[PDB]
Structure formats: C-alpha cells, structure tokens
Amino acid sequence: DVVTREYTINLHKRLHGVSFKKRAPRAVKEIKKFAKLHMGTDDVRLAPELNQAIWKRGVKGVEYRLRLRISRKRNEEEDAKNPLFSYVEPVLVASAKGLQTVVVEED
Amino acid sequence: AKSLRASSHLNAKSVKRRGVFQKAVDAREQRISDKLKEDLLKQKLEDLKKKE
Amino acid sequence: GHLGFLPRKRAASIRARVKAFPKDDRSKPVALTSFLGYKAGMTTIVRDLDRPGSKFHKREVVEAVTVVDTPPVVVVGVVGYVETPRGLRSLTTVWAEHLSDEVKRRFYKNWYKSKKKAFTKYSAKYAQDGAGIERELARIKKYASVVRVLVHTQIRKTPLAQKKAHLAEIQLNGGSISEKVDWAREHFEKTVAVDSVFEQNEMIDAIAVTKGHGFEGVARAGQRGYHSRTSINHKIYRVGKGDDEANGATSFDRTKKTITPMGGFVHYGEIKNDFIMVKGCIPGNRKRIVTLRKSLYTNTSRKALEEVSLKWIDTASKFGKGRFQTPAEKHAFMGTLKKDL
RNA sequence: GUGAACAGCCUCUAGUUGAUAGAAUAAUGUAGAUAAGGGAAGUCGG
RNA sequence: AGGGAAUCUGAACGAGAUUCCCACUGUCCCUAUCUA
RNA sequence: UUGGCGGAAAGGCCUUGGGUGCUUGCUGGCGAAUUGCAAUGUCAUUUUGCGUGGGGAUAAAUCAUUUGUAUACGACUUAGAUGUACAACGGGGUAUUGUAAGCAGUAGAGUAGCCUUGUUGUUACGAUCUGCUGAGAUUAAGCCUUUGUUGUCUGAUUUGU
C-alpha cells in the first residue's frame, strides 16, 4: 500500500547523551530507524535536502524536533529488499514544535 | 561496655518481656486480626452485590 | 568489609524470598506474618516527640520516611510443610481454581505467543463436588506442621508497566493448623488488605534486592549491588487508603491532599491504592518489589512502644526543588498566568 | 579582514577530505575541570 | 588629549638557598562528580 | 473387590468378600532316556528401538524487536498475535533558566535639523529604562498522566516421559 504521512521526530530524545562529534551521522541513522519503525520496510531512502537540513548547524548542533514527510512507494526491478522503499523529505515550517502526524493527500 | 549477647542484659530484657512489653503487642495483634475478620465481611457484601 | 555479606554476588531474582519467619504461638488468632508491595517513594515528615528521657521530649523532630506502594494482596493458594530430619518438605500445594490474568502471566516468560492454557485441567479437576480438592486439604490438615499462604500482588492497580504479578509464600502464626488451612479455604480468590496485617507504631523488617551498581573496581574488585538484603526495625508511621482522600492530611495540617507529590514521585507514578509509610530508608530503589515481614520477636523498647503523632507530610516537588504542597498553593502564590487569562 | 599587535579567530586564490570500519559507552588508567567546611593538619620535603 | 621580612651564601640583587609572617589552594581530613 | 491404615524417603501394610486354578494331607496309573561318564547349561532384571490393539491428552522455549528495577559480554527484569495493547507524535502537569522575537511609547541623556528662540514647542538620530511579558525556550532521553491524531500486531528455529 503506497501511503504518505508526515511526522515530527524528537531528535532531542534520541540524540541525548551522544558525543558532539557523532550526533549528525547518528541523526541520519535515527531518522532511518524511525522510518523503518513506521513503514515496516528496510530500504529507507533520504532526500538530499533533508541531509542539508540535518547538517545545517555543523555536527554538534542538530535541532530538537524536525518535521518530516515519510513516503512509502514501490521499488523497481533488481531489488534486494522486495519490493517497497520509504522516501523521507523535509517540509517548510517556522517551528516544527506542536504538530500532529497527518496523512498527506496525494494528487 | 556490656555486649549484645551479655547474659545479664538478656535476663533483664526477659524481665521486661513478661510485663507491659508483650501485652501491648498482644493487644495490637487482636486489633489486627479483628480488622482481618472485618475484611471477610466487606468482600462477602460484594459477593452479595453480584448475588443480588 | 563485612565477611557475613558473602559471597558478594548477584541475587537469584528481584523478588528476594524471606529467609526466616516469626516463631508461632498456638493460642493466638490467625493472622499474616509477612506482606509485600512495591517500594517507590521517599518523603519528609515533622512530628512532636513524646519520647521521655530524651533531649527532645515535648519538642518537634523532622525526619525522612519512605513510601512503599502496597495494593491489596490476593490469596491464590496454600502450602503445607512436614517437619523432617532433613528440614521442611512441601508435600501438597493447593490453588484457587480461578486465578487472575496476572498470575497465569507469571507462569510464562513469553506471554503473547502462548495459548494461555495454564490451569485448564486443574480447574476441570475441581469441576465436581470437590472430592479431590478436599482430599488434598485433608492431606494438609492431617500432616504438615507449618502452613504457608500463596499470594500475589495487584500489579495493574500499581502504575508499573510490568503487567506481571509476583507469587509469594507467607506463613501463618495463628494456632491450630486446622484454623490455618480453613482460613485459606475462606480466602481462595479473595484479597487481603494491608491494615489487616499491619497498623501504626509497629516495627517491621523490609527485605529488598539492593540497587544494582554493576561491575566495580581483602578489598576485592567485582560486583557491587543487586544483593538480597534484610533490614530490621523500621517503624510504620502510617497505613493509608486509596479511596480515602486526605491521606496527606494529619491531625495538624488537615488539608485535603494525597501523600503523592506534585507530578508524582520520580521515575514512578502516583499512589492509587493502599500504602505503608515506613520510617528511614528501605533497601532497593523506586519501582522495586519489597517484602515486609514483622519483627520475628517481641522487640519492645521505647523506640517500639511510643505512639507517633504525625504533624505534617511534605508533598512538595521531589522532581526539581520543593516550594508548594498542592497545585492549588502554586497558583495561589503565583497569581494568574498567561494561558489562564 | 577584525584587532594597539608576528596573539589568536575568520576567509579569498589554489589544493584536500587520505589515515580499516561498524556497534556499544560499566569500572579501571592517562589528561583536564569543579566542589561545603577547615586551609599543609598531607608528605623526608606546598 | 602569590606577596612581605629576616638570615646563610657570590645595598640592590641572581627564577641562589634557608627560616619566619601574611594570602592562596583537593596536598590532605575525604573524597564526590563531569568531560576528553 | 469392602474399607481402614501408612508422610521419615509415605509408594507400601492389613482387611472385606465372589470367582478361579493348584495343593506333596494320604493312596493309584501314565509320561522322562540318545544332553551318549562332566562342561552356568541360559528360567534374573534394567534401559531401549521397530512392529502390533486398544485407551488417553490438543505446548512452550530461544532467536529477532522492546523495556531499564539489570547491564563488560553473557546473564537478569520487562513489554508485544485486536486490547482500560503497544509504538510514535500531541495535550495537561512538574521542574530549570529569568522577562524571548517582533512592535509601540512620551521615559529619555546627548545631537542633527524648521525657525514662532522654546520654561516636558517642534521634526529626526538617539546607550538604556518601560509595556505586551514570571514571558519565551527546554522539560525524558532513567520525571508523572494520557477520552487527542497516526500507525503495528507476525517472522526463523529448537524441544517428548
């Protein structure tokens, strides 16, 4: 089932007690793990714009709550994770603090 | 100082334990067992709530 | 260190079992000898001290007490033990025919995968005029020098996210073994309250598995913590009630409040049921199951005979710093706020 | 370029991202901090 | 626009040495916690 | 087959009877040999497996994920096949810091600037003070609570008296 939702992820919670040199790469791994939790598929692909969003404040200053657009799709022929992939994009907001997980209407 | 296992202190404490010192515990026990007997009747009323 | 507390190793389980019991008098009424709950909490009390001979006679003393949460223990069985030249030997246990979801959970390590087929043939074994159950109860009453009660805790009424209750064994110090096994017969599927075991001004010995600190480095390196410790002579200051509001109310304070602090205890919930407020500090941490036995012997000094006149219960915020007893006193002192109006 | 300054801190031109990785994060060890009250009582010897 | 005062040594000295007076500190009483 | 008894390892002891073979209590009649002059001459009792012909009974554990009362790793405590279930968010509390961003003002040193040469005259610049503002931010990661919204519920192995 190809379904797209949006999610606020508490990166203050997951990156708590993590060394300053390794927050941003872990934040990539935490977003991937979060998307694997919610979509039930292995291949979590990430937007290059989302990568720009994480790594904005260097390595030591990744934000507390980020609002994402995790999207289930269908993966093409010659695939090892058979046969669905998630794709995570950022969405524009002044503050991500205080948003409900909402199903995106596709047109 | 007299030890914890000093014979005379054990005998003086046995002089205590045959007086007030046990009687208060033997009154407290009766009050505890009383409320325990009171705890059967409440639950039996909640048996009769369903039996109604 | 202390060579008695050896080997300094990790315990068999979090629920430490009680090693010894209070003796026995064969003329006393039937009453429980040990109780269990869930230790979680610590708080400050003031009281006027009627301890004559002291430097604080007719003065006021502040002191630290601990709040063990104790939901009403439920009886689900009875054990009979024969006296042997080899110790004791359990010859027959008998159960309650219909047990909770909590205890049938205690019988499995993986609860969700199972067909939940625990006591199906045992309940079908009951399914008649008794006949075999009364046979095993005759077996207990005929022999078996001591009789212990199988109980369990009400885990769901406690804010713990565990769902899985603890089985225990509690002996009876009420004389005539007939009255022991027949008290049990009157108590299958039924529950036992706290204040039917304890009251105020009563010394107890709370046993607990002592707060694990893990690996540590003759004064030797190895394991520190997670040991099963028995601490004796902690005075019960208050027995409480769940339905009764104003548990935090004393003879003096008399404000309608629960002993539960603002935003609850740290790492543990509120209190929604019966509790014991014991003086000093019980071993183990918060969320820890403690088993409270009673004294072993007649332990009367003036530290055991005196009556406690509780003056005030501190219910201020333990999480952070303490400034207000009630939420009502926070917004009474504060005035009115932004999101209020 | 800021700055009184060859102090640093930031960059333009140009050139790199090479050094096994990943998962955990308890004690110990080395190094650096902070600490009630007292202020060398430590130690042969601040 | 860290002090100060004496003395032993080659009146100030010289990161000379010693002693004392004043100040300071986990050196210690007595360790506790955090980071790399 | 009627009970009674036995808890010290009871696991056995007595007893009520009906049937049922046998009895060397006593007396008869058959059969044995050639295993050749001896050769343990195998008749006991365990633990099983394959076959039979009848009864009976309808699992959990581990891995994987989670939990954190546990934790070097093991191990331990938890949680999860339609629920006062769990996960993510979300709200409410409790705490920590100390008045967020933005905007406005008559509060304004000192100045530029129109000349009505000012007795809060004026237009503008204008540290800071003041107000919206105990606000704003953070608040579980090892705090509490959950009538909100959204989703998950099924993968592999191993085990027999």
From Swiss-Prot, chain A:
Gene Ontology molecular function: structural constituent of ribosome
Q: Name one Pfam family in it.
A: Ribosomal_L31e
Q: Does the keyword Ribonucleoprotein apply?
A: yes
Q: Which UniProt keywords apply?
A: Cytoplasm, Ribonucleoprotein, Ribosomal protein
**CDD domains for this protein:** Ribosomal_L31e
Question: Biological process GO annotation list?
Answer: cytoplasmic translation; regulation of translational fidelity
What's the domain of life for this entry? Answer: Eukaryota
Against InterPro entries, the record matches this protein to: Ribosomal_eL31, Ribosomal_eL31_CS, Ribosomal_eL31_dom_sf
Entry keyword Nucleotidyltransferase:
no
Q: Where is it chiefly localized?
A: cytoplasm
Q: Which Gene3D superfamilies match?
A: 3.10.440.10
Give Gene Ontology CC terms: cytosol; cytosolic large ribosomal subunit
TM segment ranges: none
Location comes to:
Cytoplasm
Q: How does it assemble?
A: Component of the large ribosomal subunit (LSU). Mature yeast ribosomes consist of a small (40S) and a large (60S) subunit. The 40S small subunit contains 1 molecule of ribosomal RNA (18S rRNA) and 33 different proteins (encoded by 57 genes). The large 60S subunit contains 3 rRNA molecules (25S, 5.8S and 5S rRNA) and 46 different proteins (encoded by 81 genes).
Q: What does this protein do?
A: Component of the ribosome, a large ribonucleoprotein complex responsible for the synthesis of proteins in the cell. The small ribosomal subunit (SSU) binds messenger RNAs (mRNAs) and translates the encoded message by selecting cognate aminoacyl-transfer RNA (tRNA) molecules. The large subunit (LSU) contains the ribosomal catalytic site termed the peptidyl transferase center (PTC), which catalyzes the formation of peptide bonds, thereby polymerizing the amino acids delivered by tRNAs into a polypeptide chain.
* Similarity annotation: Belongs to the eukaryotic ribosomal protein eL31 family.
Q: What else is known?
A: There are 2 genes for eL31 in yeast.
Per its record, how is this protein called by name? Large ribosomal subunit protein eL31A
Swiss-Prot record, chain B:
**Bilayer-crossing regions:** none
Biased-composition ranges, Polar residues, are 1-11
**Region annotation Disordered: residue ranges?**
1-20
Q: Which family does it belong to?
A: Belongs to the UPF0642 family.
Kindly give any further remark recorded in the entry.
Answer: Present with 6210 molecules/cell in log phase SD medium.
Protein name as it appears in the record: UPF0642 protein YBL028C
Organism of origin = Saccharomyces cerevisiae (strain ATCC 204508 / S288c) (Baker's yeast)
First-to-last residue of the parent protein present: 2 to 53 of 106
Curated annotation (Swiss-Prot), chain C:
Entry-linked PANTHER family: 60S RIBOSOMAL PROTEIN L3-RELATED, LARGE RIBOSOMAL SUBUNIT PROTEIN UL3
Q: What organism is listed for this UniProt entry?
A: Saccharomyces cerevisiae (strain ATCC 204508 / S288c)
Gene of origin? RPL3
* Principal place of residence: cytoplasm
Q: Name one GO cellular component term.
A: cytosolic large ribosomal subunit
Locate the Phosphothreonine modifications and list their residues: 92
SUPFAM superfamilies this protein is in?
A: Translation proteins (SSF50447)
The reply to whether Cytoplasm figures as a keyword in the UniProt entry is yes
Is Protein biosynthesis one of the keywords? no
Name by which UniProt lists this protein: Large ribosomal subunit protein uL3
